[PDB]
Design a protein around this ligand. Structure first.
Ligand SMILES: Nc1ncnc2c1ncn2[C@@H]1O[C@H](COP(=O)(O)OP(=O)(O)O)[C@@H](O)[C@H]1O
Ligand SMILES: [Mg+2]
Length: 378
């Protein structure tokens, strides 16, 4: 069985396999090339991936996500403390270790963050195995560059309990670089900038590659800035619109809002290729159908400050690395949010027209690289 590369993401995960000199990013049951890092517990079953996310509005307290933010940390971590105040699921202390508490089959159960991730990892494994038609054991899993030893350990453990023999844990920026073959020895030092704007995290990393050896010169970003924030801006915009037209503030109905958000995330994606998308939601509030639309122009303006602010961390990364804008040789786009045209324009204008590397879907870049690395390692 060939080794696979797995991108264990904060919001979405992806798995790819190197086969016959080519890397294939594997699609799941629903045909998606990335699957949400969601796990849901109901009266009758345990849902993972699309099935889990597809019922979040209906089962909020028992639908777990953002496990990557918990993994490898302590309950006392100020991060954990700050974060938990935003999740609809319970997090409890267990001898210093945080645990997610849910109700599975009427019985109350709690899980260590590594167990939730192992569930997502299991899903990826099934996906690869269904595709390959054979058992998958060896794997290369990615982790952010800033993950400490504990977090790396936990990620490794999540792998082992999923029945995966984790060959190596590599940083995602390095994985992105390898996908573009930027590790090929050219007899010279190379500076690369990884711009990773994902579902909920923003990471900028500057790598220096010499003789086939990576060196993370600097990193910057925002652990709480991703595609979700753009979705919210759309949500708030439409709540205001619904109220003007119907005089009904749907803010309190957690379901109506969550449904609108799902509709927005979908419209958002369409806006990356089309200039406008329609929002068709039957019975949003009471029995009122919400039928409307947004233009790319309006979308961009609703997130103007967020998009623009994206550059500040880029400047920081440069100065920490002691490099000038002209000294970086390659710029690679990672993360689903980098498919947004306004983000690409903005980064390019900043780097004075420099060509951006983005022939490989940004949300599949990390998986692609890990698959290549898995291959060389096995
Ligand atoms: N075409 C698109 N335009 C904008 N956002 C997109 C597009 N395709 C996927 N996304 C977004 O990218 C995020 C997923 O990013 P991804 O890199 O897959 O995740 P992660 O951050 O979990 O590694 C979500 O916010 C999703 O809405
Ligand atoms: Mg990612």
């Amino acid at each position: 069985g060939p080794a696979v590369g797995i991108d264990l993401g904060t919001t979405y995960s992806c798995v790819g396999v190197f086969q016959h000199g080519k890397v294939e990013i594997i699609a799941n049951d629903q045909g998606n090339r990335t699957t949400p890092s969601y796990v849901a517990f109901t009266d009758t079953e345990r849902l993972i991936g699309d099935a889990a996310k597809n019922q979040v509005a209906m089962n909020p307290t028992n639908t777990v996500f953002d496990a990557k933010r918990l993994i490898g940390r302590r309950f006392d971590d100020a991060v954990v403390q700050s974060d938990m105040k935003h999740w609809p699921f319970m997090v409890v202390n267990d001898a210093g270790r945080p645990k997610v508490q849910v109700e599975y089959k009427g019985e109350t159960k709690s899980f260590y963050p590594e167990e939730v991730s192992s569930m997502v990892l299991t899903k990826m494994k099934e996906i690869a195995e269904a595709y390959l038609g054979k058992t998958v054991t060896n794997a290369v899993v990615t982790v952010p560059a800033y993950f400490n030893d504990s977090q790396r350990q936990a990620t490794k453990d999540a792998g082992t309990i999923a029945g995966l023999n984790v060959l190596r844990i590599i940083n995602s920026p390095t994985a992105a670089a390898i996908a573009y073959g930027l590790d090929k020895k050219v007899g010279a030092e190379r500076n690369v900038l990884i711009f990773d704007l994902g579902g909920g995290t923003f990471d900028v990393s500057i790598l220096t590659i010499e003789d086939g050896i990576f060196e993370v010169k600097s990193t910057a970003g925002d652990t709480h800035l991703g595609g979700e924030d753009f979705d919210n801006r759309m949500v708030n915009h439409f709540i205001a619109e619904f109220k003007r037209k119907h005089k009904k503030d749907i803010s309190e109905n957690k379901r109506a809002v969550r449904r609108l958000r799902t509709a927005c995330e979908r419209a958002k994606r369409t806006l990356s290729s089309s200039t406008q998308a329609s929002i068709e939601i039957d019975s949003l509030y009471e029995g009122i159908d919400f039928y409307t639309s947004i233009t790319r122009a309006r979308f961009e303006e609703l997130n103007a400050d967020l998009f623009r602010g994206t550059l500040d961390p880029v400047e920081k990364a440069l100065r920490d690395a002691k490099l000038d804008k002209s000294q970086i040789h390659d710029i690679v786009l990672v993360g689903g949010s980098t498919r947004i045209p306004k983000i690409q324009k903005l980064l390019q204008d900043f780097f004075n027209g420099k060509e951006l590397n983005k022939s490989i879907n940004p949300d599949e870049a990390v998986a692609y690289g890990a698959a290549v690395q898995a291959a060389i390692l096995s």
